């Protein structure tokens, strides 16, 4: 009825600061057991854990590694609804410069009370390193605004025997993609190994494709992505010679992506990097999730539920002492539902974008692409026939959603 898990994060060197989260996936596992083997289930959850769990669940117990790189999870249940429990583990945030461990899983009993796990790192790794050229923390979930330039790094090892004849290696694929929309591929910014950029040597010598290319949609299904084959370009030989002199070393592929107006809230969007040396064998990792914010209002005649169009608003934010006001690009000829390509901020309120209500029934002013935190909707004009009731409506964009509810705002009829 009771078990313990002692996690040991080490990378020779122990690692303090790494936070782990435990997930009970007992019933998620036994669901797959109907269609699948124990091994196929065990791996499926380990591979794509976020498919089976909310990875940022508050209730999922979380602990941080101490000085010794050690993290206890005391007193777990052995059973779970008449099944021997199966628990999954996930490194939620990692300190610099360390990498994110693989998402390991265990099925009970094995019996053993004090169970010591040692979460090793994945053979492919992905991170969100920067947002608008400013470094962020390595964590499983990042909240984003529309028009943000996101910088990703996919890291993987070169085989020790890369220059073998048997040539042995004629393919070094690197495939990144997202299943759901939200990003557009901006650019490949570097390919570094041994802290030295080899992108200039490789350009015009690899195969390289992305979402922006006409050849992508016929060959790949996905809205965002890029494919990169080192040994499948116009000069595979020279590119193999280049890689052999860094045989064993860790290549990092950096690229930028732009958050677009198809990115919607209530939708966490991950990416997946796949590395393959042949069509037979792939090593693969899922990056961190990203989500954006939004909010809905209902402008109405006081007392009734009468929707009032052409009530003008500006969105206000605090920057410590400083008031700032939203400037929405890509919203020429929109009203009610605003789906901007970039929300940027100004201290001059005369320059701020005037948001006008539509007169739709359910909610007649929506904004997407917002960061979470506190805001204030300021009514600059009531529609003709109505005076303003309360000039400011302060609210909170909840992290990754449309909010807990649509915010009703009343106008007073003059007659």
Residue numbers in the entry: 37 to 47, 66 to 164, 171 to 226, 233 to 481
Paper text:
The L. rhamnosus GG genome also carries the genes for another pilus operon called spaFED9. The tertiary organization of GG-SpaD is a tandem assembly of three Ig-like domains, wherein a middle domain (M-domain) joins together the N- and C-terminal regions (N- and C-domains) of the pilin subunit.
In the hexagonal crystal structure of GG-SpaD, the N-domain is angled about 100° from the M- and C-domains. Contrastingly in GG-SpaDO, the N-domain is nearly perpendicular to the two other domains and situated midway along the M-domain. Because Asp181 has shifted about 5 Å away from Lys45, isopeptide bond formation is no longer possible between these two residues. The crystal packing of the open conformation revealed that the single GG-SpaD molecule in the asymmetric unit lacks a linear pilus-like structure. Since this offers a unique structural perspective to backbone pilins, we suggest that the open conformation represents an intermediary snapshot of the backbone pilin during its sortase-mediated assembly into the SpaFED pilus.
